[PDB]
Amino acid sequence: STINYDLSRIKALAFDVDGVLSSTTVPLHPSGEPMRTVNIKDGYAIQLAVKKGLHIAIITGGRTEAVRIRFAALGVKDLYMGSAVKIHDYRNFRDKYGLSDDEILYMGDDVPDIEVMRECGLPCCPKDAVPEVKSVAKYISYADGGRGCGRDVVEQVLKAHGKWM
């Protein structure tokens, strides 16, 4: 669905990992660390978004190594991991590029994402985000976490800039 926001002023998109770029339910590695998922259609749009000049960030509380490598390989340079207080890292990201809050989209799925979602210009969440998160979101994707909700908003922003084709 189209987002209730002037997407033309979005210059940056930030994402939670678990329940957003990765599925909420994932296999467990023998090591005890979650084996995350990535969505290939998410991937296409994200690498394109980086090529077209949008600042992309991931902000996660874990040390999700495999996710770091994958998105690094997509050109994403702002990878905030072990983010115990996400709002502090969001601020770092915003200020690093001299952005205003109204220029940043953030997509989260669970309560540790709420503080950022309250400060960012365009809070978004997947179709299966928790109710507390849906109530703070300006847009709720048609797609569940890990299954194309990233592709959804990235494609919308790129199209609105005429940078999709």
Closest distance to a second copy from the beta carbon of 99 (Å): 28
Nearer to Mg ion among residue 42 and residue 110 (C-beta)? 110
Query: Is 136 an interacting residue with respect to a second copy (CB under 8 A)?
Result: no
94 binds, among Mg ion, a second copy, none (CB under 5 to 8 A by kind): none
Sheet with 55-59: strands ordered across: 78-80, 55-59, 12-15, 104-107, 122-125, 139-140
Segment near a second copy (CB under 8 A); pick from 4-12, 60-68, 80-88, 115-123: 60-68
Supply the minimum distance, in Å, between the C-beta of residue 87 and a second copy: 15
Q: Which of 14, 19, 105, 150 binds Mg ion (CB under 5 A)?
A: 19
Cβ–Cβ < 8 Å for 153, 146: no
- Please tell me the count of residues contacting Mg ion according to CB under 5 A: 5
Amino acid at 157: V
Asked whether residue 109 is marked as a ligand-binding residue, the answer is yes
**Mapping DSSP to helix (H, G, I), strand (E, B) and coil, where does residue 137 land?**
coil
Q: Which of 1, 2, 31, 162 binds a second copy (CB under 8 A)?
A: 31
Please report how many Cα atoms fall inside a 13 Å half-sphere around the Cα of residue 67, on the Cβ side: 31
Place of tokens 């994707």: 141
Type of residue found at 85: V
Task: Supply φ then ψ for residue 153, to 5 degrees.
Answer: -70, -35
Is-contact 138 123, C-beta < 8 A?
yes
The span from the CA of 100 to the CA of 118, in Å, is 14
Q: Does 109 bind Mg ion (CB under 5 A)?
A: yes
DSSP label at residue 116:
H
156 binds a second copy (CB under 8 A): no
Binding positions for Mg ion, rule: CB under 5 A? 16, 18-19, 109-110
Q: Which residues are annotated as a binding site?
A: 16, 18, 109, 113
Binding positions for a second copy, rule: CB under 8 A? 18-19, 22-41, 43-44, 64-70, 72-73, 109-112, 130, 132, 146-148, 151, 165
